[PDB]
Ligand binder design. Structure first.
Ligand SMILES: *[C@@H]1O[C@H](CO)[C@@H](O)[C@H](O)[C@H]1NC(C)=O
Ligand SMILES: *[C@@H]1O[C@H](CO)[C@@H](O)[C@H](O)[C@H]1NC(C)=O
Lengths: 75, 82
């Protein structure tokens, strides 16, 4: 049954390698996931800034136009 | 007496391999789980960015509309200048 011990010990070595491999994997996947999410975050941010610029121009115009209308009124 | 040493060493090495097998199993579980999560979060982000784009567009439209509305009003105010 000692031969059995040898075969099993070996089986355990193999398994350990596989586990290490998976681990490297998971860690890697987490890294990738993290960076993609980071890209999207940044695109959402700049996206936002451009939307602020937009709404600002808008409110500004609404104001300048309201004013014009009023000026026309008193005329 | 080595025989006993090998019954033991064997027993713990057996148990050990079993532990690793469950271990790997759990690792795959966790890996696919992580993929899932990843794809999910990104879908969310995508939907978010799309929405950002439509709102931004609508904004730009609105701005132009108001510049025209403006050029009109301005011409009236110039008419009054007479
Ligand atoms: C499992 O893998 C690690 C990392 O190489 C190794 O150092 C350790 O001895 C292994 N464990 C067993 C019980 O074989
Ligand atoms: C461990 O898992 C492998 C692959 O499924 C299997 O072939 C092997 O017999 C298992 N070992 C033990 C100790 O259960």
């Amino acid at each position: 049954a000692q031969k059995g011990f040898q075969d099993v010990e070996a089986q355990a070595a193999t398994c350990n390698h596989t586990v290490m491999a998976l681990m490297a994997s998971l860690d890697a996947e987490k890294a990738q996931g993290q960076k993609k999410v980071e890209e999207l975050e940044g695109e959402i941010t700049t996206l936002n800034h451009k939307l602020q610029d937009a709404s600002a121009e808008v409110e500004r115009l609404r104001r300048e136009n309201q004013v014009l209308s009023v000026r026309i009124a008193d005329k």
